[PDB]
């Protein structure tokens, strides 16, 4: 279906739904909570989602957002993701599940219906991950199907980074480009038939999780989807 929205900043959150630990703060989307002294709260997850559902049959889309990761230690956890899931998808487990999976089913592709681009700050021992911080494409599992090294210089930069995520509904390819101002650039693409996974309605949004010593903020977000016919 056709949907477009545009938040050049989050001085408005008019169409955003907040769930779990996520809230509007400092004219951003703050995905995980901080205490009264600004300290990241451990073992929490949050979602901030565009409230209106859309459909993916015979559709392409483009979305872009800017983000900051604030860390208070050399051992931050766990990161965040942009995701697509059905409209009733809730905030799931905190920690390495990224708010997107339940522990009992996190690597069982038949038991999930969620696609994400993850920004992973903590190498988990509990399932297969690369031994470095990474950006990945997740299809129905916390074990990414396509993963690339995320440089620690960029992780810890405190810069406002940009992500571009597109889906070509003809070739059935999901792509992410991630760019840092005067830092790294990252490119990942994967063939995945989203309309097969999601024959009905979906919502798009962000999920963050702790972990420890980390807060994730979305600074701007725009989206457009168009028919392929």
């Amino acid at each position: 279906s056709e949907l477009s929205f545009n938040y050049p900043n989050f001085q408005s959150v008019e169409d955003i739904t907040f769930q779990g630990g996520a809230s509007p703060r400092n004219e951003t989307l703050q995905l995980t909570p901080t205490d009264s002294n600004g300290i990241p709260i451990r073992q929490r997850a949050g979602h901030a989602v565009y409230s209106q559902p859309f459909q993916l049959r015979d559709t392409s889309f483009y979305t872009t957002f800017t983000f900051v990761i604030r860390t208070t230690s050399n051992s931050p956890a766990d990161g965040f993701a942009i995701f697509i899931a059905p409209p009733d998808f809730p905030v799931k487990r905190y920690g390495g599940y990224l708010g997107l999976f339940e522990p009992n089913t996190a690597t069982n592709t038949s038991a999930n219906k969620v696609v994400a681009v993850e920004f992973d700050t903590w190498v988990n021992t509990e399932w297969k991950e690369p031994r470095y911080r990474h950006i990945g494409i997740d299809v129905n599992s916390i074990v990414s199907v396509r993963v690339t090294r995320w440089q620690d210089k960029d992780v810890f930069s405190r810069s406002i980074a940009t992500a571009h995520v597109g889906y070509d509904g003809i070739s059935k390819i999901l792509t992410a480009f991630v760019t840092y101002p005067d830092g790294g650039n990252y490119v990942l693409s994967h063939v995945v038939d989203l309309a097969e996974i999601f024959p009905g309605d979906v919502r798009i949004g962000f999920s963050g999780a702790t972990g420890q010593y980390e807060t994730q903020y979305i600074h701007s977000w725009s989206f457009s989807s168009t028919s392929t016919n």
């Binding site: 920690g95 390495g96 988990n124 021992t125 509990e126």
Partner: peptide, 4 residues
Amino acid sequence: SSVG
């Protein structure tokens, strides 16, 4: 695991 880090859980707990």
